[PDB]
């Protein structure tokens, strides 16, 4: 069964920054490409950003260009997010979600297969 | 939707026949200097998921081997002195008449008028030969047995016939593929291959009859051969344990040395210091027979399963094709293995009479000759049997020792290793294309 | 790993060790020695031109322009980079090798001479 | 055409064969063969090391930074495409092979400093 | 100055006379003679393998994304540059040569892949 | 041509009794010398 | 016809022919041939 669990989150002060997390399992965590998708209260779906799996190439919505900070470290099986400068139109549901991008080998999809249940960001 | 990439550093390969360098370790015959003084560690990378088949038979390997030998000997020989001299009417007589032993009649006494190093002068050599070096013309007179066909060359009395192991390697851009398996009969798939740079050391040991000092089989005694139906082809038996023999010259022999022109000398044997006794071989008859009751159980496995397996004598030819033979201390013996291959198989020690000789034509090359000193003192050997050479001629099959092909002795050897080339280029689909 | 490790290995997996296998490429009877060695020479070279002909000349890796075509073994491609070994794709392509490396020459001088022409525009 | 077919053909035409040509440049007695072997691998090389040099490294066809001199036979330029063989440049042109070579070799050495200075600008 | 004229020279200095020395590279008792020209190439080969291989195939300076580790003989910027001849610094480094090329290799292969995932982003 | 270029700042040292330069030089000669004797008359017949 | 130089008599002249000119060459003598040995593996061969 695949999961993606996320953690972190809160309420923080508008120019303040907080981290994410999300940990997975039921799938091999490095051969899959991640990423980040906002759900704003009453927007439903903006992309933020993208890791693909060697956690080398990172790609950004421009609106978080300059401050946000998506990694992977893939012997924890771990997909992280880092967001300085926080501004109040970033309040949303951050979601752990698999897909996007892929190896250039192994049929690339350009969709997101799974979902996590997101944490709830504050600003 | 797929585009065509291009890979280089690809790891893949393709059989190939290619020149092997030889690397080596330590006068010798075998120390030329052409064979490269290197590390012998032993580097090897297991190919976790790979099977490749092998075929020992059309090794390549082998018949750089043999020619490297051949060549290597020949050049050992080269600037040698050539006892042009010897091949004289010789005059002889018995050495020991008054002996009524096995070696009656063996050792001859025999007179030369021979060169000095003057041009103008010549002296009188008294000299002891072997029955087998000579034969008459019709006190008789004599000829050395080289006199059919060639010139034969003293050998080189400073330099030991020792069989110092040799490696080969790989030059870049290729490989050597190590079979690894267990029970591998020479042809067909070795799921546990391994690469590896060089060969284990292999000792150029040269033989008939029964395979000396070689490697042994890791659980079973493996039979090997290239077509198991076909009586034309031979057999080789590769035993998991060695049968000792204990080989002897117990003669305390003297030798001497006659200048024979500006700067040659001949050696030759002198006398004899005590008594005269015959060369022998000693084998543990249990041992033996528990030898071949293995060699045996494994035939029935492909051939024979409810049969009769008989061994026997060889069927005749001169002696380097129906007697085994070694070269040990220097010394070639030649010995009767009839009392090896005297039993039928239905579903202490043995001894072996052995005979010496000087003149020596090695690898059927005819047209050359060595002449072997003799050596001073008495001669000792321990080996160990590898294996066996036999061929095969109802309900009973009959077994005979092989030999005088030399590349049989190597195949024994190199049958795990197959030298490929590497081949590092190939394309592939993918799903990225040039911005061009 | 080391040389020829990933022989078994997926030929996905495989694409990891190019380094290790092409550094393993350079690193009378003595007459017959120096032959062998200077004949390795002239087949390193071979590679390296046609390397340098397809626009591909220092890269372990590179893509070309000429898409791969159906009749070239169509095995999938999940299956040919998770499920096969470079060794078993050497032989399933054995027979479209000239015609790919032919291609490739042809899609790279007209490669080179768009280049040229674009060089020439003020 | 095939190896030289081209060798009659304009220069213009000829630079359509380039391909050809290069692959013909790989594709005691026996002492001496060995000899010319070596010594047409040690020819080949140097040819591939100008083109090193120059900052041509990989290319059939490339562009250079150094200007044509009107003294180095200057004979129009369609005329020299259009109307002349390549046997028939390498002799117009042959006192200036030198000049040019180091002209080519200068007007490298520039580049390769002008591009170490931008890498380090943060 | 000519061949090796700069080995008194500052690392700085003599980094202007690259094109000389690379040039100087290439330009029974006679198969000895034919063995040394052939392990020359060999040699030859090598160098320009690594280049290869490091992503620095047709330069001969060129720049990397392996940091300087202070660990590595730190001896400040300018003071190698300007106060030190390569003939010196060649030993304040020896033990760090193989651990350098090393690390050079793996910041390539991670290039190339990326390199190549970026290419199939359509 | 004695081309030359000298190393305005470099100094390093010279062994002159471990200079390989020597040893070549020394069967060069040696085999040079053998090899045009080797076709000529063996006068073998005058040792008498 | 070809030579080096044509108007010169210490060189030769090369004719090449359009047209072969067939001959027949024969030693139409039966003859035998002997061997005798004059070595340890030599032996020389001789108009019998
Ligand atoms: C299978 O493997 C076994 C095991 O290795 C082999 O058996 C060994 O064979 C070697 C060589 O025959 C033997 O070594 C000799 O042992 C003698 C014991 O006293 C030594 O005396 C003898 O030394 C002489 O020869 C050397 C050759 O280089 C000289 O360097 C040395 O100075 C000695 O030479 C003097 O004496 C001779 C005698 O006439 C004289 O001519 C010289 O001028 C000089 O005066 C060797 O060391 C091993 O001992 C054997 N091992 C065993 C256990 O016996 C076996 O042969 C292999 N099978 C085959 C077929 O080869
Ligand atoms: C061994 O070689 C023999 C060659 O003699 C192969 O089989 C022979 O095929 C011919 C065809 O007419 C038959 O007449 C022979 O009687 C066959 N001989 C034998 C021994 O069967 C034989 O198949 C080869 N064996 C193997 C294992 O390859
Ligand atoms: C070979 O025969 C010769 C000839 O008889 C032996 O030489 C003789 O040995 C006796 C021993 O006392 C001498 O008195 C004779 O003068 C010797 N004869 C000559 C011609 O010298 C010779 O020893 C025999 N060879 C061996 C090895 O015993
Ligand atoms: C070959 O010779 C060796 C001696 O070099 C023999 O080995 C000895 O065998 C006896 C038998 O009981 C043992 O007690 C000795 O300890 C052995 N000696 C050594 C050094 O091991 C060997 O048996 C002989 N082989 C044959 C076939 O006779
Ligand atoms: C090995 O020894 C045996 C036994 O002496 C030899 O075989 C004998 O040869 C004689 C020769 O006429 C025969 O009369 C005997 O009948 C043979 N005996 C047997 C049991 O067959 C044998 O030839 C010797 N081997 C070699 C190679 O010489
Ligand atoms: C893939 O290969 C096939 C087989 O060669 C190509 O099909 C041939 O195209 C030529 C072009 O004129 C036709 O004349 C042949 O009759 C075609 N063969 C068949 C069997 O139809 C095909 O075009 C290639 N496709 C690509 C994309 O290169
Ligand atoms: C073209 O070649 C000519 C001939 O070498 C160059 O003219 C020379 O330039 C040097 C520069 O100092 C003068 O000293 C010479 O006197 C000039 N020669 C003549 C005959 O005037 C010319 O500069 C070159 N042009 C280009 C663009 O490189
Ligand atoms: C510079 O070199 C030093 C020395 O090797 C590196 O320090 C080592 O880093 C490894 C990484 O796990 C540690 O296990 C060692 O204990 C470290 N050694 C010491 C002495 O602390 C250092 O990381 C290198 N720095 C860079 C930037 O590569
Ligand atoms: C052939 O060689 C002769 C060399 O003798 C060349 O002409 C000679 O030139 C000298 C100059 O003084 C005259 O004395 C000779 O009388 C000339 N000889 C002839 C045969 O004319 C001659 O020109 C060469 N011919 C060709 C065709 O090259
Ligand atoms: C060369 O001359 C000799 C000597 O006369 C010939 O040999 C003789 O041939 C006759 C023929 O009947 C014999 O009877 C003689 O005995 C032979 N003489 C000798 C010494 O053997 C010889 O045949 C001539 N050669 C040829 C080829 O005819
Ligand atoms: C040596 O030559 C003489 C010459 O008459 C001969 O009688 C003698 O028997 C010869 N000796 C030997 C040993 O051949
Ligand atoms: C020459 O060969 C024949 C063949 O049987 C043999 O009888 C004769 O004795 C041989 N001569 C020599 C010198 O061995
Ligand atoms: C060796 O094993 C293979 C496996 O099929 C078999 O075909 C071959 O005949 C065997 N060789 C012998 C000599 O039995
Ligand atoms: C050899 O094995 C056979 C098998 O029947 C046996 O009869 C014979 O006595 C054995 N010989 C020895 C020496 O054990
Ligand atoms: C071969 O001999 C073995 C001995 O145990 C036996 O088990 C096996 O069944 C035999 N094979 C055949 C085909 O009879
Ligand atoms: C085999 O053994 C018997 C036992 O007496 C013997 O008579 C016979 O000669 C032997 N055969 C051989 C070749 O030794
Ligand atoms: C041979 O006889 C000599 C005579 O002194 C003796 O010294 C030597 O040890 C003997 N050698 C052997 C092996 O018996
Ligand atoms: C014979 O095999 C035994 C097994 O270990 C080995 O120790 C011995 O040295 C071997 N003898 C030879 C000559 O290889
Ligand atoms: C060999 O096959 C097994 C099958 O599960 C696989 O796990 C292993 O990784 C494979 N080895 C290589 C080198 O691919
Ligand atoms: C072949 O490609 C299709 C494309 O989606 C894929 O679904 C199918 O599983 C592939 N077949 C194999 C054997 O991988
Ligand atoms: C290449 O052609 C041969 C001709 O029979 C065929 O057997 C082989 O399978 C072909 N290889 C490929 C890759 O199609
Ligand atoms: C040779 O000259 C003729 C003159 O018209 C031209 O048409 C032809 O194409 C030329 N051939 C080549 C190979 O250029
Ligand atoms: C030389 O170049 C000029 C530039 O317009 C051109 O008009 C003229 O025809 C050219 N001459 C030749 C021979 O092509
Ligand atoms: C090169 O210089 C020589 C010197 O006479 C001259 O004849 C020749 O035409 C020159 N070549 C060129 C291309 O100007
Ligand atoms: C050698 O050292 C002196 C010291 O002032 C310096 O001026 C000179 O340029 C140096 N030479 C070289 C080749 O660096
Ligand atoms: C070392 O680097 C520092 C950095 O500013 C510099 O000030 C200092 O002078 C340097 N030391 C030497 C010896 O150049
Ligand atoms: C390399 O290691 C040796 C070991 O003693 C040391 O003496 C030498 O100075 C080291 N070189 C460098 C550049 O540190
Ligand atoms: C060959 O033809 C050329 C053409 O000019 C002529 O000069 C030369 O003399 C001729 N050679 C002979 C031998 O006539």
């Known amino acids: 069964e695949v999961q993606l669990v996320e953690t972190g989150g809160g309420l923080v002060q508008p120019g303040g920054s907080l981290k994410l997390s999300c940990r997975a399992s039921?799938?091999?965590?490095?051969?899959?490409?991640m990423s980040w998708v906002r759900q704003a209260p009453g927007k439903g779906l903006e992309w933020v950003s993208l890791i693909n799996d060697r956690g080398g190439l990172t790609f950004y919505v421009d609106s978080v260009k300059g401050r946000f900070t998506i990694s992977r470290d893939n012997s924890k099986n771990t997909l992280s997010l880092q967001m300085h400068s926080l501004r109040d139109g970033d309040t949303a549901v951050y979601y752990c979600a698999t897909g996007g991008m892929s190896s250039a080998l192994q049929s690339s999809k350009y969709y997101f297969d799974f979902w996590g249940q997101g944490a709830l960001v504050t600003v | 939707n797929l585009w065509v990439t291009v890979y280089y550093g690809v790891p893949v390969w393709k059989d190939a026949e290619t020149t092997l360098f030889c690397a080596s370790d330590a006068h010798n015959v075998w120390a030329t200097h052409a064979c490269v003084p290197t590390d012998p560690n032993p580097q090897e990378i297991h190919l976790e998921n790979v099977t490749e088949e092998f075929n020992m038979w059309k090794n390549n390997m082998v018949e750089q081997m043999h020619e490297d030998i051949i060549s290597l000997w020949d050049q050992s020989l080269k600037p040698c002195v050539k006892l042009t001299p010897l091949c004289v009417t010789l005059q002889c007589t018995n050495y020991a008449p008054k002996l009524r032993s096995m070696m009656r009649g063996e050792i001859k006494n025999c007179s030369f008028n021979m060169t000095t190093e003057l041009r103008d002068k010549k002296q009188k050599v008294y000299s002891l030969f072997y029955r087998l070096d000579v034969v008459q013309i019709n006190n008789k007179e004599y000829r050395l047995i080289n006199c059919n066909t060639s010139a034969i060359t003293q050998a080189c009395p400073k330099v030991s016939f020792e069989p110092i192991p040799i490696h080969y390697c790989a030059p870049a851009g290729f490989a050597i593929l190590k079979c690894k398996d267990k029970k591998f009969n020479g042809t067909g798939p070795c799921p546990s291959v391994s690469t590896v740079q060089c060969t284990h050391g292999i000792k150029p040991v040269v033989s008939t009859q029964l395979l000396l000092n070689g490697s042994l089989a890791e659980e079973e005694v493996i039979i090997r051969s290239e077509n198991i139906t076909n009586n034309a082809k031979n057999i080789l038996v590769q035993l998991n344990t060695p049968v000792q023999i204990n080989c002897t010259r117990p003669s305390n022999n003297t030798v001497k040395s006659i200048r024979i022109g500006p700067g040659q000398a001949f050696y030759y044997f002198g006398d004899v210091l005590g008594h005269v006794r015959m060369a022998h071989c000693n084998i543990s008859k249990a041992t033996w027979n528990e030898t071949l009751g293995k060699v045996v159980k494994q035939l029935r496995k492909h051939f024979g399963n409810n049969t009769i397996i008989r061994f026997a004598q060889s069927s005749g030819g001169d002696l380097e094709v129906t007697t085994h033979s070694f070269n040990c201390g220097g010394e070639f013996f030649y010995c009767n293995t009839s009392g090896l291959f005297n039993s039928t198989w239905i579903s202490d020690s043995l001894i072996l009479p052995c005979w010496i000789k000087q003149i020596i034509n090695m690898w059927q090359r005819i047209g050359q000759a060595m002449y072997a000193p003799p050596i001073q003192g008495v001669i000792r050997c321990v080996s160990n049997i590898t294996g066996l050479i036999l061929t095969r001629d109802s309900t009973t099959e009959t077994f005979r020792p092989g030999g005088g092909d030399m590349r049989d002795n190597w195949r024994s050897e190199l049958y795990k290793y197959k030298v490929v080339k590497i081949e590092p280029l190939g394309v592939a689909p993918t799903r990225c294309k040039r911005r061009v | 790993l080391g040389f020829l490790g990933a022989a078994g290995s997926t030929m996905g997996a495989a694409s990891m060790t190019l380094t290790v296998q092409a550094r393993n490429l350079l690193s009378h009877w003595g007459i017959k020695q120096l032959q062998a060695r200077v004949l390795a020479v002239e087949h390193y070279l071979r590679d390296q031109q046609l390397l340098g002909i397809w626009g591909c000349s220092g890269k372990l890796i590179c893509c070309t322009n000429v898409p791969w075509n159906s009749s070239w073994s169509n095995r999938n491609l999940s299956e040919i980079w998770d499920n096969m070994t470079w060794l078993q794709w050497d032989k399933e392509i054995s027979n479209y090798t000239q015609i790919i490396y032919g291609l490739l020459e042809e899609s790279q001088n007209q490669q080179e001479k768009n280049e040229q022409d674009l060089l020439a525009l003020d | 055409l095939g190896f030289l077919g081209a060798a009659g053909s304009t220069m213009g035409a000829a630079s359509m064969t380039l391909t050809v040509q290069a692959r013909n440049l790989l594709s005691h007695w026996g002492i001496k063969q060995l000899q010319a072997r070596v010594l047409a691998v040690e020819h080949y090389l140097r040819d591939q090391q100008l083109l090193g040099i120059w900052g041509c490294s990989g290319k059939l066809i490339c562009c250079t930074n150094v200007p044509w001199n009107s003294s180095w036979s200057n004979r129009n330029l369609s005329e020299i495409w259009d109307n002349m063989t390549w046997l028939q440049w390498d002799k117009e042109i042959s006192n200036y092979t030198q000049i040019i070579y180091g002209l080519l070799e200068e007007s490298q050495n520039q580049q390769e400093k002008n591009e170490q200075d931008l890498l380090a600008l943060d | 100055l000519g061949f090796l004229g700069a080995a008194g020279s500052t690392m700085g200095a003599a980094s202007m006379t690259l094109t000389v020395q690379a040039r100087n590279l290439l330009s029974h008792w006679g198969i000895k003679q034919l063995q040394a020209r052939v392990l020359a190439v060999e040699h030859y080969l090598r160098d320009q393998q690594l280049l290869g291989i490091w992503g620095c195939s047709g330069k001969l300076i060129c720049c990397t994304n392996v940091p300087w580790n202070s660990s590595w003989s730190n001896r400040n910027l300018s003071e190698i540059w300007d106060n030190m001849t390569w003939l010196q610094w060649d030993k304040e480094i020896s033990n760090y040569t193989q651990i350098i090329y090393g690390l050079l290799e793996e910041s390539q292969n991670q290039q190339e892949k990326n390199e190549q995932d970026l290419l199939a982003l359509d | 041509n004695p081309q030359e270029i000298h190393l305005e700042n470099v100094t390093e040292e010279f062994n002159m009794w471990k200079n390989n330069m020597v040893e070549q030089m020394h069967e060069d000669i040696i085999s040079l010398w053998d090899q045009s004797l080797k076709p000529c008359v063996k006068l073998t017949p005058l040792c008498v | 016809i070809r030579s080096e130089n044509i108007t010169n008599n210490a060189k030769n002249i090369l004719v090449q022919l359009n047209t072969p000119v067939q001959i027949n060459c024969t030693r139409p003598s039966n003859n035998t041939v002997k061997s005798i040995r004059i070595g340890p593996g030599q032996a020389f061969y001789y108009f019998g």
């Open positions: 039921g799938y091999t965590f490095s051969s899959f490409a």
